[PDB]
Structure formats: C-alpha cells, structure tokens
Amino acid sequence: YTDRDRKILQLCGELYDLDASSLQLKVLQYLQQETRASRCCLLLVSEDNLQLSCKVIGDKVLGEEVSFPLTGCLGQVVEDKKSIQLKDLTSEDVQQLQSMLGCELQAMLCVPVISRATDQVVALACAFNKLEGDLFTDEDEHVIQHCFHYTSTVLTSTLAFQKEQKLKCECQALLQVAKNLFTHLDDVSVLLQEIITEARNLSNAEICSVFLLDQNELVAKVSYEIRIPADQGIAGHVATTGQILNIPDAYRTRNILCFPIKNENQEVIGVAELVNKINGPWFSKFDEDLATAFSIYCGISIAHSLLYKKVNEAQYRSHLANEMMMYHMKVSDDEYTKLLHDGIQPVAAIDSNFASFTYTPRSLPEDDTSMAILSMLQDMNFINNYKIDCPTLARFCLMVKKGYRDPPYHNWMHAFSVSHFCYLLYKNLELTNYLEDIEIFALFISCMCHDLDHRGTNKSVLAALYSSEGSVMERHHFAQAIAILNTHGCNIFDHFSRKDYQRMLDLMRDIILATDLAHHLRIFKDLQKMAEVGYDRNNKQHHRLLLCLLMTSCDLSDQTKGWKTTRKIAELIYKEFFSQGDLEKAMDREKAYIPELQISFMEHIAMPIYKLLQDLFPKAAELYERVASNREHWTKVSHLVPR
Amino acid sequence: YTDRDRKILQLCGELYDLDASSLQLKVLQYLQQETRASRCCLLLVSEDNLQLSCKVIGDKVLGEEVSFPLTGCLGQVVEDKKSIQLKDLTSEDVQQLQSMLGCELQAMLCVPVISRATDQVVALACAFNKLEGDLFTDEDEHVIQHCFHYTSTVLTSTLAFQKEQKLKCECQALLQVAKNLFTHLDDVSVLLQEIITEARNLSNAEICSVFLLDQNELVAKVFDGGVVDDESYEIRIPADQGIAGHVATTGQILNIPDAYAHPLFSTGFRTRNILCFPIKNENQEVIGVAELVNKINGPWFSKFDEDLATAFSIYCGISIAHSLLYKKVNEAQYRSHLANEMMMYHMKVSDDEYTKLLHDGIQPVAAIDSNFASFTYTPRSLPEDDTSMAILSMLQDMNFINNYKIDCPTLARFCLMVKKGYRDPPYHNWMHAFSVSHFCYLLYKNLELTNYLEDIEIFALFISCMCHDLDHRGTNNSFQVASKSVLAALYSSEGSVMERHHFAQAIAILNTHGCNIFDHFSRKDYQRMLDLMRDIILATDLAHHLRIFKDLQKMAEVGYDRNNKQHHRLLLCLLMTSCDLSDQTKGWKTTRKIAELIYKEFFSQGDLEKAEKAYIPELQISFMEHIAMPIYKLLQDLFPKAAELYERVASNREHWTKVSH
Ligand SMILES: [Mg+2]
Ligand SMILES: [Mg+2]
Ligand SMILES: [Zn+2]
Ligand SMILES: [Zn+2]
C-alpha cells in the first residue's frame, strides 16, 4: 500500500548515519515492529560468499562481530534465494543460531537480501520469535523484502566503505611496520624484538614469542635462550607443516594464533605465536591474512638480518687474525692528516736532480720520504688515473713504512731508494711504452713492500742475502703487504673491478717473489733470448720477464751509484750479512773477503743484469758502465789483498 | 507532499547502483525533469573543502573528471550554505561553467547539498538553462533540497567507498614496491634497477634515473644487464650541478611543469617535465637523487606524485643504505679470500673427500691399535690414508668434539686441509706432523695433562702440533761446511720467519670456508685460541726454546704453579718442543730410520742449484747432548711418568756413541 511507502520513505529519511552499524539498528528496529518479531538481525554473506557475519542483534550492537561458515540449510538460501523457516532446520544452524542468538527458537523468518545490482543474496535477514501468536506470514516476508528493495543499496554501501576504510588502514599499518623492521637489519636481536612488539599490536595479542629454526629445533631465546625440538608442540607442528594454525580455546591462557616464517623459497625459517586476544573471543579469521601479510616482512627481514650477522661475525674473526700479522701498526689519524696537509707537493720541488740516474735517494731526510712517495706516484699519474683516496693512500704509505724493521741494510730506507729507482726507470726509460699502466703501478707498489718486516739476513755468497731464501721470505713480505691492504682504509685498490684487483695481487705476488735471486738466476736464460729477439709488447710472456728484470734492477740499484755512495751502502749490506741468530746460543780477518765477495757478486750477478737492461733500454747504458766502473774500484781494493 | 514522496521513493528504488557515477545519473536525470532544466550536474566539494569536482554532466558520465579551485563566488555557497543564481555570479565564474558544459548560460540554480550527518555543504547541485520560460523558482530549489534529503546519504556513501578502494590499492601498491625493493639488499645493482622500474611505474614517468652521491659528485652505473665482469660505465656529475646537483645539495624535492622554462634544463628526445627527489639516510643526509622525465597521460606531475615520490623515496633510502652497507662487508671479504685463496696455492677439500672420511664412524682410538697410546708407539708405523681418521679419533678421545661442539663436517674438512697443506720434503712432511700431534695426544694420556693446563690450552697445543710445519719446504742450506753446521738449525730455528709462516698458513685455513672449527668460541675464546696457536707455533723455534730454557729450570726447580699464568706458557712451550723432537724417545731402529729423513733433508738443494755423512754421528750426538736431552730431563723433572722418555734418549744417545767409534 501507499501506506508502507510512507513508513519506508520515513525510514530512509532516517538512515543518514555514517556507521553501517547504526544504520542497521534503525532498519532492524523498524522490522522488529512491522513483523511483530521479538528480535531481528542480518547475517551478512561474506565477500568470498563462504561465511555469515552478524554484528547487530535486536537493538544491541555486538561488542565483537559474530561469524560462522556459510552452512547448508542456511547455505541453500543463498543459493536458491528462497526464504525459509525454523522447521527448515539443521540442528547446527539451530545451535549456532540460538547460541549466537541467546534463546528459545519457536519461530524464524529467513528472507534473503538479493541485490538488484550484483543480483545475489548479500544478506540473510532474520526474524525470530513472533511476538505472541507465533505466526510468520507470507506477507511478513513481503514487508521485509519491500524494506530492503529501498533500504539495501545504502545499507550495503555504508558497510562496504567501512571495509575499505579498514583494509586501507591495515596497510598504512604494515607500511609503517615494514619501515620499522627494516631500520633494524643491524640487530637480529632488536629486530627480533620489533617483530614481537609490532606483531602484538597488529593482531592485538596479550603476548608474542618468536622461534627461529636452528636446524632441527626451535630457538625462541625471547632475556634468555630457549631451545626445543623443531617438531614439538604448537610451534613444532606449524614449523613442520609450514602452515598457520588458529585456536579458539587452547584446551591466563585461552587462544593461540601461531604462524610460520619461511624464506625466499617457502622454507619455514622461524615461527611466531600470539596468545590470547584483547577485547575478543579469539583471532579474527582476518587476523590471519593480516598475520600472513606481516609474516612476509618478518621472513624477508629475518633472512637478511641473519645473513648479515654471519658476515660481520666472520669478517671480524678475519681481522682478529690479520691484526696478528700486524705488529698492530699504529697509523693514527693525526699521523696521516699531518703528512696529508692538502699539499702532496710536486717532485719538481723535491730537488733538481731528483729524477736523474745520478740521484741518491738515501740522500734525503727520512721524514721527508713518505712525501716523496706521494709525489712520485702523483707525477706518475697514478692517484687520479686510478682515483686513489689520499687519506687511504697516505695511510698505506705510513703503514708500509712502519712495517719495515731495522737492520743495517734491509730497512725502509732501502725500500724507498728501491722504489725511487723504479720511479727513475719509469721517467728515464719511459716505461709507459713497454708495459701497461697497471704494471708500472704494481712494480712500484712492490718496490715499496718487497722487504717488509725484514729483520736482516746472514766460503759464502752475497746473493744469499741481497737475494734468495727458499722463497720463504719473499712470500712473507708479499704476505705482509697483504695484511696491510687488508687493514681498514689502507686498501688503495678499493675500486678496481674484481678483475683488476686480482691481477693487482698476482702482479705483486710475482714481482716480490721475483726479488728472490734464486728465482732471477732461473729465468736468466729466458731473459736473454728476449734481449736477443727484441721484446714483444704484445708478448704476455715478455711482460713477465721484463717486470722481473726491472724489479731485480731496482733492488740492486745501488750498484749504479757513485763510488763513494756504493761504498757507503756496501757497509750496511756487509754489516748485516755478517752476524747474529741462534748462534747467539753460545771478522776483520773475514771482512778481508768483502772485496772478492763483492767483486764476485757484481761479475756474476749484478753486471749480467745491467748488461741486459741496456740490451733492451739503451737509455740504460749509463747504469751498466757505472756498474762496470765500480767493479774496477772494487778491483783495486782487492789488490791490497794477500795471496 | 505525498506526490513527490512518491517520485522520490521511486527514485531510491532505482538508486541501487554500485558505481557512484551511475547513481548520479539517475539523480540527475530525475532533476533534469522535475525542474524543467535543460541540463543538470553536481559539483562535489573536495575533502579538503578547497576544490569542486564534476564527473557527470546531464546524462553524460565524463571520460575525465573535471575540477577547479573552490573559488569565491562559487565558494560562498559552501560557506553560508545559501543557494545562488547566474545573476549572483561573476562573468569570470559564468564563463567557466559555459566553458565547462559547453553551451549558453541564461539561467542556473545552484543548491548546496548539506550533509544530514556532517552537516556541511558536500556538493553543489546545479541546474542550468530552464527548459523554456527561463525562470528557476523558490520551489524549484525546494524539489532539489527534498531530493537530496533522502537521496544524498547513499549517494555520498557509494562515493566514499570508491575513494577508499582507490586509496587502499594505492597503499597495496606501495607494499608491493616496498617488498620488491627490500628483497634485493645484496647487489645494489639489482635493487638499484628495481628502484627505477618501480619508481617509473609509480609516478608513471617516460624515464627514471637514479644517482648515488659518491662524496662530492653524483654517480650512476650503466646496465640492464650488459655484464659487470670488469664493471660497466659510470657517470659522474658534480654533486651540486644541474637539477640533481641542486636537489642533492638542498635535499628537497623539485617539480617541473616545463623543463625549458627552467634556469637548469636535444638529440631526438625533447623533454617536457621533470620530477626530481632526494634520498637521504636515517638522519637526513641525501644519499642519492632520482629524476623522472615526462608524465605519461598528463601535463606534469600531480602534486600527489611528490608525496608518493617522497613516500617511496623513504624505502629507497632504507634499502640503498643497508644494501651499500652490506656490499662494503662482502667486498672486504671477497678481497680477503681472493688473497687468502692465494696463500694457499688454491687448496680444495672436496664435498666427496670429506664425506668419504666422515662416514658416520669416527671410530675410537681403542680399535686403532692395542697400545696406540703407550709411550712405545710409533705413529709413523700407521698407513697414510688412516692418519686423518686417527686425528679425528684422538681429538675424540681427549673429549674435544663434543666439549666444544665441533661440527664434524667442518672439523674433518680442517684436518684434510691441514694435511693437503703439508708439502713433500724428506723430513718436514704431514707424517712428521701426525707423529708430532700423536705425541701430544700421548702426553695428554700418560701424563694426564688435564691436571696442569686448561682444556683450551691442550686444545691449542694439539692444533699447533697439527700445523707447526705447514707448507714447509726442505731446510738445509749451503752448510758452513756440513761438519761446520748444527742440527738445531733445521729441527729448530729460522729468524722465526718460517714459524710465523706455519702459524699464518694455519690461519688461512681457519679463514677458509667451513673449516673454522673455532666457529662458536666467544670472541674471548677465539682470541685467546689464536694467541695460543701463535705463541705455541712460534715456540717451535729452537732459538726461542734456548731463549726461555733458563726459565724452564726455575719452574722445574720450584714446582709448577697451576695458578701461575707464566708457568702455563713455559709448560706449553716445553710440551710443543717435546712433541717436535719426540722421535728421540722412540726405539733405536725407529729413531735410526727417522734420522735418515732428517739427514737426507738437512743436506741439499736451494739456490746452490742456480748459483761428510760421517759427521751424522757427532752432529747427532752433539744434538741430543746439547738440545734434545736437557728437554726430556725437564719433562721428567716436572712429570715423573715422563722418565721413560728421558732414559730412551739417554740410551739412543749411547748407540749413536757406538756408531761414532
Ligand atoms: Mg730481498
Ligand atoms: Mg718447525
Ligand atoms: Zn731488497
Ligand atoms: Zn716439527
């Protein structure tokens, strides 16, 4: 009648609430009337069309939303969109109803809410206990229909907008939490805590504990440490099965929501359980997809967080050891900043003759040396050509210097004068034409390190000092230079592609082990044919013997100096060569040999080298003749020797 | 009024659409009627109540929602909730509506939709060009009102719902990216692409470029996957240059409508707009910059593509920061092993080798041999393939595997690596090492070392016995004659140079993968367990032995404090020395067979190659007399069960005396 169309229009006038719940009251309360039903309520059919939900019964807006599987007798309504009555009952729907309900069920009118839009039962409108003459009519059903035909659109939309308002909210939630667990990849311990806090507020649990699978067992240290079998109890099952587990009653216990962690694959890597719901009977079957959502970020973060500990742990042990090879070398910040005072200086300002074969590196001050190295590499365009952080480079140089010990001869001062030669060779013989830049770098870096941590060596041959060992010692020096590169902010080969970096290691390993006179002798016959048959810049092999050769030549480079200079150094070579050890455990008439020993060295070792050098580099002849000369001075000092 | 209250109920009967737009149509096409207005449309007041929007004009649902600032003439309606008419509009306003709807404007009825809940003008109901007889009445405005009073709620809620559904998947959008990025914190190269792919979809740019601040300059590596064998092109622009430079320098976003119109902006491209934004870390230090070029389907960058950029830019900052932080480590690590690999001549214990050794049966010592533990045992007697086991069985029986929870797959790998780790001289071979370790082992039993030293020491001792001569070669050299030489120059000292080498070698193993049997020691143990090995192995220097010898006496003279930390050092040195020359305690034909190896080594090779056996008695006699004996006399001067050893050296000393004759 136009009369129902009075009360209805009156209704919709009133349904102006923003809350789908408060709208439901008005609609219910109006039916509670027009059907003489004691109590009325709507069971909203789930999005997945597989569950019923009821948040408002009668004139009471339930504290917690009641829900339950979309059964059969109550689940057939949804299907044929036909209205049923109590006499059409399972004892379940009758149990789960009068339970959710709260009383005697004598009557019941189920009229399906079918949308004119989607066109499907969206809600199950229920009327119970007909006030009095328990008689729900074929018209009691009509009034219901009629009501929703107008009222349903809005009801549903205010309800839906409220679902997206929630959905939108559990993301900003997660967006937040994602950004909080990721700010602690530093500390699996802090992170592990975050996961707990966050996991507790997200679901609103009384308590969360988190277990990290440790092989065949769960360890929720969460402060003490708690081991236990990986397959035992709740945690063990969930961990074993890799699938969530929800508990209504567990039997201040009650409920437990427990979920897996799993990694990139689906390998459960940990497990977490929440106990007891706050403001609730259990865990919203929504508190599961939300927990699963979260649980992705827990697995992502734990996985990397642990994988980062493993490194830091290891890498630490790696240096605990490496500082052992260091005699703990002290290169203080003040030390390096002091040397590195924005002025690397230029070689030109070092000295006029600083670059001519007639220079005597030992002639400089010892505190003015590490500079020269910076200005020597600088001018060889190596700092910029390779983008060498200076704070690092100046730290290397100071460390390599503090790495030399103190014998007469085998001291840092020998390493500098050996490197300075290398430097000379570079300029004077223009090495850029014969070898790649990375070689001239390694050759020089080697000169700087070849005798590191040396302590001095000692019917004998000089090429047993200034020379060989079993390569044992050459391997040491190389090994020591490595410890330096392995020291923080000292690795000057920081940015080299792994490609360069490796070869930068091999190069240095070869060159330094090349400083073994016993090795030189071995390749010597190879160093000749190359001298005989040019020197292929394309020949990878020829590069090797050149680099050996140059090294050797820098190493005994003191043979090419002035007589009075070689005279002075020979003192140091021989002061060393003749002393100490384990002999300690219990010379003038044996310094008489210093001449023959010396003469023999030059003739047999030293000259055959400078001969070669000038047999490849004619610019290198001045060195040979210098060696051949000094040889003759030595020859005279030998005349004074008896026979 | 029952008649409108007929038409209205009839309207809501119809307003069952799910699309807020299809609902606006029915409401609008009802009003196009009831007011005899040529066309109708609603202008929805923005959430921020600063903008009017219209997606439906007449019976046409617009392909692109129209919008515009909530003006003054149209904005006073929102304020006093008073409905107005064209004659209340400024020509300015007027020209906009005409232009917005595309027709003449003679009439117009604007009725404010006030919320029955919020109670605020939510929309502006517009009636245009009165269908002939241009006259919009005081009741034409009433039918409008009335209509909404019922129709407005549902209208407003369907609208709302649609905005939340749009907001929710714009959040989920962020979640996917956030997760896509946070799962690439290994190589900052892959993640760095993601940041691009992702950020480019996020704002919908034609192109994205990411730059990382490398000190005082912006850097950007080339890719898509060319191949970084030997890296792959790196762009550097001064950190304060152009757009990125500014944004990097000022650390604040930068939006451009037209880029040519910029002080800071040609080979085909021709760029329109640019959105550039900073990266910054936990503090607010710009760590990187990213620019998006050209908007797809748009003039520029929504002032919403900015907050979105900022939002994302957070995750970028998070991941980039950690990603790089991890590379730094991993580098420092590859750069170690690469070196470490080399001080090893690339040793490789195979996944098969180890499992073959480790066949669930460590076997006990007891089943090795009857008195495999008695002072008369000749370790050298056993088979070479059967040694590594013995080790495993000896550490087993001393209770070290479990007491320290040594992973066996790690431990067995270690043992096979320190073995493959020895070389091949006559005397300084793995066999010397096993026999030397074995002697340690014996000592532990027979003297019951558990009463004098801490279990960690007996552990370092043994482990040193295992490596003390790693990677050894043959010592000998030149001989000041061969009669003018001392055995305490082989079976002894060096300059400590070599002992430092064996200690260091053993470190390269521990530093090799799955061999660090000291994996789980507290940083405290791990350290001390390294000093221990360092000291002990350096103690295998005869020159060092002699050096502390006088201190090895007062201890032997004055008891042996187990509380003396100093007594434990000497005691451990002594023990090592004793295991080193332990073959002096073996049986005459045993020691005789050994000395051959010692003496075969002690006499050969070197640089002599590049560049007298009759003394084997005095040489050896002199050894025992000066070095070897005073040791075993001290071993028995502290351990009386160690007497059997002394006498066995003193005796062997005597046979040697006879071979001398
Ligand atoms: Mg040398
Ligand atoms: Mg040794
Ligand atoms: Zn040298
Ligand atoms: Zn030994």
UniProtKB/Swiss-Prot annotation, chain A:
Keyword DNA-binding belongs to the record: no
Tissue specificity of this protein: Widely expressed. Expressed in brain, with high expression observed in the corpus striatum. Also expressed in heart, placenta, lung, skeletal muscle, kidney and pancreas.
Binding positions for Mg(2+) per the UniProt entry: 451
EC number(s) from the headed UniProt entry: 3.1.4.17
Effect of residue 249 to G: In IDDPADS; uncertain significance; loss of 3',5'-cyclic-AMP phosphodiesterase activity; loss of 3',5'-cyclic-GMP phosphodiesterase activity
Annotated protein name in UniProt: cGMP-dependent 3',5'-cyclic phosphodiesterase
Regulation: The 3',5'-cyclic-AMP phosphodiesterase activity is stimulated by 3',5'-cyclic GMP.
Domain comment in the entry: The GAF 1 domain functions as a dimerization domain.
GO biological process per UniProt: adenylate cyclase-inhibiting G protein-coupled receptor signaling pathway; aorta development; cAMP-mediated signaling; cellular response to 2,3,7,8-tetrachlorodibenzodioxine; cellular response to cAMP; cellular response to cGMP; cellular response to granulocyte macrophage colony-stimulating factor stimulus; cellular response to macrophage colony-stimulating factor stimulus
Residues annotated for Zn(2+) binding in this entry: 414, 450-451, 555
Active-site residues per Swiss-Prot or TrEMBL entry: 410
Cofactor(s) this protein requires: Zn(2+); Mg(2+)
All copies of domain GAF, residue ranges: 19-155, 187-302
Reported function: cGMP-activated cyclic nucleotide phosphodiesterase with a dual-specificity for the second messengers cAMP and cGMP, which are key regulators of many important physiological processes. Has a higher efficiency with cGMP compared to cAMP. Plays a role in cell growth and migration.
Disease implicated: Intellectual developmental disorder with paroxysmal dyskinesia or seizures: An autosomal recessive disorder characterized by global developmental delay, impaired intellectual development, language delay, and early-onset paroxysmal hyperkinetic movement disorder that manifests as sudden falls or backward propulsion, eye or head deviation, and dystonic limb posturing followed by chorea and dyskinetic movements. Some patients may also develop epileptic seizures or only have seizures without a movement disorder.
Subunit and partners: Homodimer.
Effect of substituting residue 559 to P: Loss of 3',5'-cyclic-AMP phosphodiesterase activity. Loss of 3',5'-cyclic-GMP phosphodiesterase activity
UniProt-reported outcome of changing residue 558 to A: Decreased 3',5'-cyclic-AMP phosphodiesterase activity. No effect on 3',5'-cyclic-GMP phosphodiesterase activity
Residues of the full protein shown: 223 to 900 of 941
Family of the protein in this entry: Belongs to the cyclic nucleotide phosphodiesterase family. PDE2 subfamily.
Consequence the record notes for mutating residue 573 to V: Decreased 3',5'-cyclic-AMP phosphodiesterase activity. Increased 3',5'-cyclic-GMP phosphodiesterase activity
Keyword annotations: cAMP, Cell membrane, cGMP, cGMP-binding, Cytoplasm, Disease variant, Hydrolase, Intellectual disability, Lipoprotein, Membrane, Metal-binding, Mitochondrion, Mitochondrion inner membrane, Mitochondrion outer membrane, Myristate, Nucleotide-binding, Palmitate, Repeat, Zinc
Cofactor info, note text: Binds 2 divalent metal cations per subunit. Site 1 may preferentially bind zinc ions. Binds 2 divalent metal cations per subunit. Site 2 has a preference for magnesium ions.
